[PDB]
Design an enzyme around this catalytic site. Structure first.
Site, PDB file in Angstrom:
ATOM      1  N   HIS A   1       0.815  -1.235   0.000  1.00 40.71           N
ATOM      2  CA  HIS A   1       0.000   0.000   0.000  1.00 40.71           C
ATOM      3  C   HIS A   1       0.833   1.263   0.000  1.00 40.71           C
ATOM      4  O   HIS A   1       0.456   2.274   0.605  1.00 40.71           O
ATOM      5  CB  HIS A   1      -0.907   0.038   1.219  1.00 40.71           C
ATOM      6  CG  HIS A   1      -1.779  -1.156   1.344  1.00 40.71           C
ATOM      7  ND1 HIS A   1      -3.097  -1.145   0.946  1.00 40.71           N
ATOM      8  CD2 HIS A   1      -1.527  -2.400   1.811  1.00 40.71           C
ATOM      9  CE1 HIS A   1      -3.627  -2.331   1.170  1.00 40.71           C
ATOM     10  NE2 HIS A   1      -2.696  -3.109   1.692  1.00 40.71           N
TER      11      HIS A   1
ATOM     12  N   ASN B   1     -10.128  -3.246   3.388  1.00 47.12           N
ATOM     13  CA  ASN B   1      -9.937  -3.260   1.936  1.00 47.12           C
ATOM     14  C   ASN B   1     -11.270  -2.947   1.269  1.00 47.12           C
ATOM     15  O   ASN B   1     -12.308  -2.950   1.930  1.00 47.12           O
ATOM     16  CB  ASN B   1      -9.473  -4.650   1.445  1.00 47.12           C
ATOM     17  CG  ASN B   1      -7.964  -4.893   1.616  1.00 47.12           C
ATOM     18  OD1 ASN B   1      -7.154  -3.958   1.783  1.00 47.12           O
ATOM     19  ND2 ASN B   1      -7.576  -6.167   1.557  1.00 47.12           N
TER      20      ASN B   1
HETATM   21  C1  HDD Z   1       1.571 -10.292   8.150  1.00 49.13           C
HETATM   22  C2  HDD Z   1       1.576  -9.422   7.124  1.00 49.13           C
HETATM   23  C3  HDD Z   1       0.269  -8.728   6.703  1.00 49.13           C
HETATM   24  C4  HDD Z   1      -0.881  -9.284   6.309  1.00 49.13           C
HETATM   25  C5  HDD Z   1      -1.286 -10.782   6.392  1.00 49.13           C
HETATM   26  C6  HDD Z   1      -1.815  -8.202   6.059  1.00 49.13           C
HETATM   27  N1  HDD Z   1      -1.128  -6.997   6.163  1.00 49.13           N
HETATM   28 FE1  HDD Z   1      -1.892  -5.121   5.876  1.00 49.13          FE
HETATM   29  N2  HDD Z   1       0.116  -4.340   6.002  1.00 49.13           N
HETATM   30  C7  HDD Z   1       1.163  -5.047   6.562  1.00 49.13           C
HETATM   31  C8  HDD Z   1       1.178  -6.399   6.793  1.00 49.13           C
HETATM   32  C9  HDD Z   1       0.157  -7.290   6.559  1.00 49.13           C
HETATM   33  C10 HDD Z   1       2.243  -4.128   6.867  1.00 49.13           C
HETATM   34  C11 HDD Z   1       3.573  -4.587   6.209  1.00 49.13           C
HETATM   35  O1  HDD Z   1       2.454  -4.090   8.302  1.00 49.13           O
HETATM   36  C12 HDD Z   1       1.753  -2.737   6.422  1.00 49.13           C
HETATM   37  C13 HDD Z   1       2.580  -1.906   5.415  1.00 49.13           C
HETATM   38  C14 HDD Z   1       2.653  -0.525   6.060  1.00 49.13           C
HETATM   39  C15 HDD Z   1       2.064  -0.700   7.426  1.00 49.13           C
HETATM   40  O2  HDD Z   1       1.870   0.212   8.243  1.00 49.13           O
HETATM   41  O3  HDD Z   1       1.568  -1.956   7.542  1.00 49.13           O
HETATM   42  C16 HDD Z   1       0.411  -2.987   5.892  1.00 49.13           C
HETATM   43  C17 HDD Z   1      -0.441  -2.047   5.360  1.00 49.13           C
HETATM   44  C18 HDD Z   1      -1.786  -2.188   5.086  1.00 49.13           C
HETATM   45  C19 HDD Z   1      -2.686  -1.113   4.692  1.00 49.13           C
HETATM   46  C20 HDD Z   1      -2.276   0.346   4.469  1.00 49.13           C
HETATM   47  C21 HDD Z   1      -2.470   1.178   5.731  1.00 49.13           C
HETATM   48  C22 HDD Z   1      -2.137   2.581   5.292  1.00 49.13           C
HETATM   49  O4  HDD Z   1      -2.924   3.153   4.480  1.00 49.13           O
HETATM   50  O5  HDD Z   1      -1.077   3.097   5.739  1.00 49.13           O
HETATM   51  C23 HDD Z   1      -3.911  -1.624   4.518  1.00 49.13           C
HETATM   52  C24 HDD Z   1      -5.191  -0.856   4.099  1.00 49.13           C
HETATM   53  C25 HDD Z   1      -3.835  -3.039   4.828  1.00 49.13           C
HETATM   54  N3  HDD Z   1      -2.530  -3.354   5.161  1.00 49.13           N
HETATM   55  C26 HDD Z   1      -4.888  -3.927   4.787  1.00 49.13           C
HETATM   56  C27 HDD Z   1      -4.799  -5.284   4.979  1.00 49.13           C
HETATM   57  C28 HDD Z   1      -5.908  -6.220   4.890  1.00 49.13           C
HETATM   58  C29 HDD Z   1      -7.379  -5.790   4.660  1.00 49.13           C
HETATM   59  C30 HDD Z   1      -5.432  -7.448   5.171  1.00 49.13           C
HETATM   60  C31 HDD Z   1      -6.167  -8.804   5.217  1.00 49.13           C
HETATM   61  C32 HDD Z   1      -7.441  -8.963   5.570  1.00 49.13           C
HETATM   62  C33 HDD Z   1      -3.996  -7.325   5.377  1.00 49.13           C
HETATM   63  N4  HDD Z   1      -3.643  -5.988   5.247  1.00 49.13           N
HETATM   64  C34 HDD Z   1      -3.137  -8.351   5.688  1.00 49.13           C
END
Ligand code: HDD
Ligand code: HDD
Ligand SMILES: *[C@@H]1O[C@H](CO)[C@@H](O)[C@H](O)[C@H]1NC(C)=O
Ligand SMILES: *[C@@H]1O[C@H](CO)[C@@H](O)[C@H](O)[C@H]1NC(C)=O
Ligand SMILES: *[C@@H]1O[C@H](CO)[C@@H](O)[C@H](O)[C@H]1NC(C)=O
Ligand SMILES: *[C@@H]1O[C@H](CO)[C@@H](O)[C@H](O)[C@H]1NC(C)=O
Ligand SMILES: *[C@@H]1O[C@H](CO)[C@@H](O)[C@H](O)[C@H]1NC(C)=O
Ligand SMILES: *[C@@H]1O[C@H](CO)[C@@H](O)[C@H](O)[C@H]1NC(C)=O
Ligand SMILES: [Ca+2]
Ligand SMILES: [Ca+2]
Ligand SMILES: [Ca+2]
Ligand SMILES: [Ca+2]
Ligand SMILES: [Ca+2]
Ligand SMILES: [Ca+2]
Ligand SMILES: [Ca+2]
Lengths: 688, 688, 229
Positions: free
Chosen positions: B63, B136
């Site tokens: 994202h 999402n």
């Molecule tokens: C174990 C890893 C993992 C998994 C399984 C998920 N995510 Fe996540 N996601 C992350 C690891 C992550 C992250 C790497 O931690 C991020 C990247 C930047 C942050 O702050 O978190 C992130 C960002 C991130 C953002 C952006 C937030 C923003 O605008 O700054 C969204 C909207 C989502 N995720 C949504 C989801 C949804 C709806 C998931 C499943 C239902 C999901 N992610 C599963």
């Protein structure tokens, strides 16, 4: 590859391990029961996700969008009478290189074909240290002092409030800066010409921009400009074509380079210098220390020193390309700086900024940044220390380590040395040199030197960009500045953007020219890696067979034929759905494919009995043909394929439209002629 | 803008200072003489360049490309019988919010209109702590365990060797993963449908995806799915139109949101929950803990809790939008987790990853991340410590600080508490739950529920994507998996990509549907922020004047009329050169502009007596019209402007083509009808 | 203003064993007791023309100017009168720089001073882990900040101006340049000049390493000579 191979990790036919060599599985979290919560003691989960969570590093502050390749430099001579530089000390001496090409303004993941200045950064891994020339595809830069860099870059980059627009100068702040700081005008004209939107990184030249010094062992100096003269030839897009490419293939240029190297079509540049004397600094009518000025090749010819060939793609983009950290401060004995205030300040920035990217001081220890020469010094520690220094007495002068490492200077140990006759004189001051004040004569020189069509492309670019400038103050200021270059240029732009036509200001008007300065007007030297799209039909297998026949006629000049049809079948390369004019340097309609090109295909109702395909969007084949024509590309048709030209209202008498009975040598000769011309400029209207 | 205003820097009519408040100038480096070297003692130069050198931070691992806005949440009721959550405790209770929307795969400069899942992250700054729902625009996710996230993401992101392709699943590794891991099929169908390419962030719904628990003060629980129901309506592009937008306006969606808010057209979503019992986890034939499954609204309706309105743009994108750090671990009393293994692992990742982004542990101290509730704890120090803790005895239990801070729990101090009846049972294991094994029934449910055109769009998307997959093994594995969803789907995709049509495998076939699940088939609820491009001519001033007349009739429904002409003149908004069909939701040819739309305009030689314009590329006006038609947009013509439709072979008998004598109320009515339909699906061929 | 007092070595060692915090404790307790220590700020005032005329180079940081040659002129008084509330936040995080200079003061060509200017700006990147260390409370000025510096990890401000460049019209030319004559800008002393070849050399004026050590030695009471020995 002997050096870098020691860092390779090969994962063919092996069991999965942790980062510390323990065999593991990594597909299910450890849970308390079948449907239970995940346990904290799952170290496999946490190590895997921690690595993932921390994959990213900050993108480069500028030139974030780029690609790299490995190569090798060969010296054409013993240049020891010109420079002490080791890599130029013998005819046939070879030095490994790494090169990165880039745009300037866009972030990671922005389109390759944005209009911008382009980076051209070349590292020589010499036996006497890493030497980087960190250059651009344009010989002059926007500003005259490094201290103005954040101002220029803040103006060109997206707005501070909403971060719009990406990878574009077509907004108020950019043109505000350009019109407030007229030093920018020369580079601006280059960027608004074809040089802002090249066909590929193989089809540009490179420049060091600054005047540097070359210095012999005995301290004699010359002033030089560095040139990388491309051996493929210059090729550029028109704007509407560059935009469409950005939509269809953001990776167009990086793909072009990667594929060319994989195919063994290694692009080459010759390294050249314009050689001048210390006494030449002011005598040409401009200051050699001024990076907004070129030295016309009519005044000082380019002396060719050797040749770079790029011949190996990285194994891992992140490890090699993303992590390469260039610096103009990576200098070797035999080269020295000049007092160009843009160069002067650059030296600070590139050492400092690597702390941001790498997160610590030991960035020169990354494999891609390491020298192919021994390291011996008293620098110590720092996060990410990958070496184990054996000397526990890290200071000079010492007796405890018998006086080693020893000092190296001009006369002993082949040390770097500053050119010994350089001097300082005058009051300490924060001023603009009075020698830097002519911002308009050289822009006019460039303007005069272009073919009519490329003058029109500059006008059209400026009309497009400044029509997107909301501020009337900025639009007016732009026209005032352009008018000092050429009243013709100014008037032609003004007419599109609602600014009153200015009266001539003749202070800087002149009629001098310099040869072949534009991106347009010369034929390509090599056709390597250009693509001919053959538009065929699965319903007429003979149309597909023409592909192989055309390919055989064109294989000797390194041109690929891409067979496009409705669906993947034998000998089909791409489908119409996945295709676009911008993928091809020439488009040819195969014999038997003409039925796909009906004049009504754009708008006919796709009713059951209508016969229209669901395999591609309505009108796709004709769209590819018409786009190819409008963009100025070579267009051809074979046999009854010529009916498609009739449908698109394309007359075969037009330049760069070719027809033939079949894909034989006669037709192939015509296609090669078209590809060499590359773009047919008579399809573009010019102001009267 | 009470709270954040304490951090504002206002730079109106002030003198420049250093970061430590010393007035300075910053336009010239300090040199030794007029043309001399730059001095190390120039601290002004170094401080300015150092800040610049360090501007960038790592982009988000996923994202990275996104945009944010401030807003407000209003509770519709006292929900205390359902949850102890303070923000839902009273009718009318208002809570500030920040929301960020995003794509998933692309880096930070990638195009807004890439095909992808989209993020929908909402922060509530509640009076009992920050609460984030990190959701999402699609209610199901690709994978069933968080430990698989780096696998999924490495597969969808660019290749490791060359970093191609940007922001695209159209490559081997992505489809290799999808076909090796059939849990991905449900999300894949949503992303290949209109939901992968929405018209704007205002025209999508949001989902929490996971089942969560709501908990009352006395420990009673319900299982819920969170929904954000959009009040504007669903609107989506077709693929060819999304690609074209990526080339013309990479910032299309961020611009739409910014402009809507500036115009006072505040988009709204209603927060809803599907309310279920603990005993319902396995009752519906699938596991509520399985994030690849939806609960159809026919089984459990959505109960509406309140409304979010986005009503304020950030002041500085970097400080607010780039730096916002969401975490599902930002939970409040009244909400609890479930044993969803995807949710479970997420909790680890979001706390850890901020260390990468911020470079240290104190990221919650950034203004945008601060709570609007008191902070009192024994956490200390860390780089970037912006507070000064007065208590020197930072431990519990203590007497030295009289036992403060005091423990808060279920019964005292309104502490967070885990739902008290949650239990663990069984062996510690790394397994896939047997309850998660049906990967195909729900994809078939989704497929059954779409209008015929959207089924075709999915087919066309998969044909496009898998034609770019080189591996025959991957292509075949894909068709085998699709066939388990639907033999029709698999057969229609296979025919484009050179795979033999499979025989039915009926294990998971069924005819069940759920209502309104697609992106297409329903009229828009609001027309706010939609745009009508009026194609006019400066040579016929009356054409331009029709803009104002059409605007007055469309003002009340929040639709903007954009006047396009050859050059910037009075009442002209943009030029043909700077325009494209993708900028407009409807295109209207003005009375008197018809002369610009000649059927030969694409290919005519620009001779002097052709009187072709240099003000725009050949055929631009007709191209805008024809693209608009082909993309399925409302098209219109006024008076003699209808001649342009004839030139383009567009029949006024077609749906979504409107003609009018003048720009009156009768014509505006037709345009309003067209805009609410949004896309005319009869212009797209469907498989027979 | 308290007077000089020092230990003998064997006493300093025993203190290190019994109270590692002896001096920090002394300061903390003195301030808590209201016994605020004071120093007067003074300058020895010399002319540009005095750089070499005393028999050593004023640019040489291994030389003192004896108070017999130039007296100390007292400018004012510092009193230390408040302990930190939190040691880490205030004391550990304070980031000094000789480059934190104000209008009315300028540098000299002392090569030790010259190079210091680089180090203190660079090293804070190590300590703070990012570029925004001047935003820590203890490092912030008690004067307005107005400039076009932007972003960086740990950005604690929200700049309202979206047009962060000079020269601009989009923000009506603000922030405005400040120099010697307008806006009370910093300025380099206008008569400072450079002359000579660029070089990596030890100045010939820096060569007497022994006369001043002898001056110091001669000036000590017998017991302190013995303590050095
Ligand atoms: C174990 C890893 C993992 C998994 C399984 C998920 N995510 Fe996540 N996601 C992350 C690891 C992550 C992250 C790497 O931690 C991020 C990247 C930047 C942050 O702050 O978190 C992130 C960002 C991130 C953002 C952006 C937030 C923003 O605008 O700054 C969204 C909207 C989502 N995720 C949504 C989801 C949804 C709806 C998931 C499943 C239902 C999901 N992610 C599963
Ligand atoms: C003082 C600021 C400054 C100024 C005036 C310049 N640059 Fe620079 N440039 C940087 C500060 C910088 C940098 C911030 O230090 C970068 C960003 C990433 C890096 O390693 O250095 C960089 C990157 C960078 C790159 C990318 C190297 C790579 O591929 O990794 C190139 C090709 C150039 N620059 C070229 C130039 C040219 C030809 C200049 C004028 C003649 C120029 N820059 C002026
Ligand atoms: C360098 O110059 C000398 C004297 O002009 C000449 O004899 C010699 O050949 C030159 N060396 C090379 C390598 O060209
Ligand atoms: C280089 O170092 C040598 C050996 O220490 C010394 O004698 C000589 O003066 C130096 N050469 C130059 C040109 O500075
Ligand atoms: C061209 O340049 C030369 C040298 O600077 C100058 O003397 C001459 O006047 C110029 N001629 C034209 C055509 O303006
Ligand atoms: C919650 O339920 C209780 C008991 O049934 C009752 O007092 C009341 O109707 C409800 N209160 C609220 C907050 O609506
Ligand atoms: C919460 O804390 C209070 C005060 O220590 C205690 O009496 C109570 O038993 C605690 N636990 C629960 C579950 O309420
Ligand atoms: C300071 O700036 C002012 C106003 O821009 C300018 O006129 C003047 O020359 C500058 N003063 C000095 C001493 O440089
Ligand atoms: Ca200067
Ligand atoms: Ca088109
Ligand atoms: Ca012809
Ligand atoms: Ca499990
Ligand atoms: Ca109609
Ligand atoms: Ca760090
Ligand atoms: Ca010296």
């Amino acid at each position: 590859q002997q050096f870098l191979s020691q860092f390779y990790l090969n994962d063919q036919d092996v069991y999965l391990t942790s980062n510390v060599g323990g065999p593991i599985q990594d597909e299910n979290s450890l849970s308390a029961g079948q449907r239970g919560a995940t346990l904290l003691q799952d170290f496999i989960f946490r190590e895997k996700i921690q690595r993932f969570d921390h994959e990213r590093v900050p993108e480069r502050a500028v030139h974030a969008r780029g690609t790299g390749a490995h190569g090798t430099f060969t010296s054409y001579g013993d240049w020891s009478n010109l420079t002490a530089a080791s890599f130029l000390s013998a005819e046939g001496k070879e030095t490994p290189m790494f090169t990165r090409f880039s745009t300037v303004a866009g972030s990671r993941g922005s389109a390759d074909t944005a209009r911008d200045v382009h980076g051209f950064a070349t590292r020589f891994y010499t036996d006497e240290g890493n030497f980087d020339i960190v250059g651009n595809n344009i010989p002059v830069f926007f500003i005259q002092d490094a201290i103005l860099f954040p101002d220029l870059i803040h103006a060109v980059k997206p707005r501070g409030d909403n971060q719009i627009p990406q990878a574009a100068t077509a907004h108020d702040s950019a043109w505000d800066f350009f019109s407030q700081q007229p030093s920018v005008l020369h580079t601006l004209l280059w960027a608004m010409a074809g040089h802002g939107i090249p066909r590929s990184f193989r089809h540009v030249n490179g420049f060091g921009v600054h005047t540097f010094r070359l210095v012999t062992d005995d301290g004699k100096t010359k002033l030089v400009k560095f040139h990388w003269k491309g051996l493929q030839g210059k090729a550029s897009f028109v704007w509407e074509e560059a935009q469409q490419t950005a939509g269809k293939n953001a990776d167009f240029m990086r793909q072009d380079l990667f594929q060319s190297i994989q195919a063994g079509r290694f692009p080459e540049w010759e390294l050249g210098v314009q050689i001048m004397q210390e006494q030449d600094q002011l005598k040409f009518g401009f200051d050699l220390l001024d990076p907004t000025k070129i030295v016309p090749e009519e005044l000082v010819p380019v002396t060719i020193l050797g040749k770079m060939q790029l011949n190996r793609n990285p194994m891992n983009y992140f490890a090699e390309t993303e992590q390469v950290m260039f610096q103009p401060g990576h200098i070797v004995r035999g080269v020295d700086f000049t007092e160009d205030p843009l160069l002067q300040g650059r030296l600070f920035s590139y050492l400092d900024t690597q702390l941001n990217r790498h997160g610590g001081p030991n960035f020169e220890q990354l494999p891609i940044n390491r020298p192919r020469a021994p390291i011996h010094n008293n620098n110590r520690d720092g996060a990410g220390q990958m070496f184990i220094p054996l000397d526990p007495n890290a200071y000079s002068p010492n007796t405890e380590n018998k006086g080693s490492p020893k000092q190296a200077n001009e006369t002993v140990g082949k040390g770097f040395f500053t050119a010994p006759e350089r001097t300082a004189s005058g009051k300490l001051q924060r001023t603009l040199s009075t020698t830097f004040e002519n911002n308009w004569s050289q822009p006019r020189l460039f303007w005069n030197s272009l073919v009519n069509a490329q003058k029109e492309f500059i006008v059209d670019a400026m009309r497009f960009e400044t029509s997107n400038v909301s501020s009337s103050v900025v639009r007016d200021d732009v026209i005032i500045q352009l008018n000092r270059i050429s009243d013709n240029l100014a008037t032609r732009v003004a007419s599109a953007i609602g600014v009153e036509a200015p009266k001539p200001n003749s202070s800087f008007y002149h009629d001098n020219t310099t040869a072949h300065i534009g991106a347009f007007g010369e034929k390509l030297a090599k056709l390597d890696g250009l693509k001919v799209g053959l538009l065929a039909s699965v319903n007429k297998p003979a149309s597909i067979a023409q592909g192989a026949k055309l390919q055989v006629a064109l294989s000797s000049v390194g041109v690929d034929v891409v067979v496009v049809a409705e669906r993947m079948a034998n000998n089909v390369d791409e489908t119409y759905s996945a295709s676009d004019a911008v993928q091809f340097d020439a488009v040819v309609v195969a014999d038997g494919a003409e039925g796909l090109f009906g004049a009504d295909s754009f708008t006919v109702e796709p009713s059951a009995g209508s016969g229209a395909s669901t395999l591609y969007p309505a009108g796709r084949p004709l769209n590819i043909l018409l786009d190819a024509f409008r963009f100025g590309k070579t267009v051809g048709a074979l046999g009854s394929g010529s009916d498609a030209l009739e449908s698109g209202q394309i007359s075969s008498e037009r330049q760069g439209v070719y027809t033939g009975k079949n894909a034989g040598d006669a037709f192939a000769k015509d296609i090669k002629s078209g590809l060499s011309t590359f773009k047919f400029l008579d399809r573009f209207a010019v102001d009267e």
